[PDB]
């Protein structure tokens, strides 16, 4: 988790001349201290888009959109941790995650170098969709578990039988 420090002097007032000469109080009113949450999101967005990107000027580029959407997503995460039962924001979160991923799968298919970088930097991990979405239910889950255990047994038994064969034939061939 990052920490856009309380004193950080909101985005719009950072580049106005001679700000640092002003007395403590006004500096304080322009701080992230007296700020909204939306100001901390503006800051977080700028900072991320500077760490991660190449051309922070292009809003249009896929990568840019992915970074922005990722800020929004981390924010819904926070909100959802506080309000467990808000179903509306759960919707925004899951939805907006799917949009991120759609865009990622679109990067990977077009500019791969960048996609690689982004996944590393935002810690997103890109999984390929499965073929066959099916609901794993009690019967199937159990049966499959069994079939897997059966398999592991059988091939272990073939291994033991081949150990016995090798030992027998070797101790025979020697004398």
């Amino acid at each position: 988790q990052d920490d856009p420090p309380p004193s950080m002097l909101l985005l719009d007032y950072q580049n106005v001349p001679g700000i640092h000469k002003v007395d403590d109080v006004v500096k304080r009113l322009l701080s992230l201290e007296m700020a909204n949450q939306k100001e901390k999101l503006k800051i977080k967005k700028m900072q991320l888009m500077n760490k991660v990107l190449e051309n922070p000027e292009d809003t249009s580029s896929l990568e840019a959109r992915i970074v922005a959407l990722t800020v929004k997503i981390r924010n819904y995460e926070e909100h959802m941790q506080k309000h467990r039962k808000d179903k509306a924001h759960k919707r925004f979160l899951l939805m907006s995650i799917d949009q991120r991923k759609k865009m990622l799968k679109n990067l990977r298919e077009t500019n791969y170098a960048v996609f690689e970088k982004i996944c590393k930097e935002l810690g997103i991990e890109y999984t390929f969709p499965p073929p066959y979405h099916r609901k794993a239910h009690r019967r199937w889950v159990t049966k499959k578990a069994l079939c897997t255990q059966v398999f592991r047994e059988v091939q272990k038994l073939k291994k033991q039988k081949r150990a016995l064969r090798a030992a027998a034939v070797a101790a025979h061939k020697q004398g």
């Binding site: 109080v25 304080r28 009113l29 201290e33 007296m34 700020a35 909204n36 949450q37």
Partner: protein, 122 residues
């Protein structure tokens, strides 16, 4: 100006009022607030009878406090004013001077609505 504190104080004499205002503002500056101004709308008969702190009140002093504060803290101040027995009733509103007036360009007259029904001849 960011928040507006509407204070309705129990109606009292000079010194005690002054005291209540002082301790109130202090509490505000301790929750991290910066106080812009202090306005006094006078003491009046309350519009209806207000029951607070085992007292049924008729009159009250009225004050506004404009101040900037970190978003987190409104709940805190609110808690504080709640348990002060000298406050008849507290409220904290987003300061009305933050919202700015868009321009009514005028009243766009709405024409009667057409084609709600087909051209059928009854």
């Amino acid at each position: 100006p960011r928040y507006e504190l509407a204070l309705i104080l129990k109606a009292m004499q000079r010194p005690e009022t002054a005291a209540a205002l002082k301790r109130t503002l202090e509490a505000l500056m301790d929750r991290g607030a910066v106080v812009r101004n202090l306005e006094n709308l006078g003491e009046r008969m309350l519009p209806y009878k207000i029951s607070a702190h085992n007292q049924r009140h008729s009159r009250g002093g009225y004050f506004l406090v404009d101040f900037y504060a970190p978003a987190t803290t409104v709940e805190s101040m609110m808690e504080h004013l709640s348990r002060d027995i000298d406050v008849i009733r507290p409220n904290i509103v987003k300061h009305p001077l933050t919202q700015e007036v868009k321009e009514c360009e005028g009243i766009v007259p709405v024409p009667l609505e057409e084609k709600l029904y087909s051209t059928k001849k009854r």
